[PDB]
Design a protein around this nucleic acid. Structure first.
Ligand SMILES: [K+]
Ligand SMILES: [K+]
Ligand SMILES: [K+]
Ligand SMILES: [K+]
Ligand SMILES: [K+]
Ligand SMILES: [K+]
Ligand SMILES: [Mg+2]
Ligand SMILES: [Mg+2]
Ligand SMILES: [Mg+2]
Ligand SMILES: [Mg+2]
Ligand SMILES: [Mg+2]
Ligand SMILES: [Mg+2]
Length: 115
RNA sequence: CUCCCCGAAAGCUAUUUAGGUAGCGCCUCGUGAAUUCAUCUCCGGGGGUAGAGCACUGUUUCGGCAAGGGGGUCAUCCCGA
């Protein structure tokens, strides 16, 4: 119950439990169990250590966790120092994908700030 | 009424005490006991004043160095220069 440096739940199906890894969604979690030869509905509790290791190498094929967290942070970093319009939206906390800001946009702005 | 000898104090402590009083200090008279007491010289002592000084406690002026702080020029998301 220790993959990619983190601990994954033991009472959950293998397909659901693997999604606890930053960088592995339901699709990738479905591919890994396929690449290892394990069913999806099997709890990782009753998984032999001879099987967990066969999952760890497959997870190594993907850029997950801190390496992904550094790639995403670098991508944003590249826009912000560039001065491009997208990086200016990241600077000012506004939405970047051309959404309306007259109303809404509270996910990027946060809760309301009275005058 | 007279003569002879010595000769103060106006301090301390306490006091419904403060211009009163009490004990002590200072005056007198008597008795007793030590080279007892004083001056000077030499010897043994502690000292924290005068003066001086500025390590300490504070205060003070000038210069040097400078953490830092602030005021600005950009930068500005974080940086920062
Ligand atoms: K818009
Ligand atoms: K008296
Ligand atoms: K007497
Ligand atoms: K004599
Ligand atoms: K002497
Ligand atoms: K001094
Ligand atoms: Mg999806
Ligand atoms: Mg639109
Ligand atoms: Mg006389
Ligand atoms: Mg009384
Ligand atoms: Mg009276
Ligand atoms: Mg003096």
């Amino acid at each position: 119950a220790r993959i990619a440096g983190i601990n994954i739940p033991d009472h959950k199906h293998a397909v659901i439990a693997l999604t606890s890894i930053y960088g592995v969604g339901k699709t990738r979690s479905k591919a890994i169990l396929a690449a290892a030869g394990i069913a999806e509905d099997v709890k990782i509790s009753e998984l032999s250590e001879g099987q967990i290791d066969t999952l760890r190498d497959e997870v190594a094929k993907f850029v997950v966790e801190g390496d992904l967290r550094r790639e995403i942070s670098m991508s944003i970093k590249r826009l912000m120092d560039l001065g491009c319009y997208r990086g200016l939206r990241h600077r000012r906390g506004l939405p970047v994908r051309g959404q309306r800001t007259k109303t809404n946009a509270r996910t990027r702005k946060g809760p309301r700030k009275p005058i």
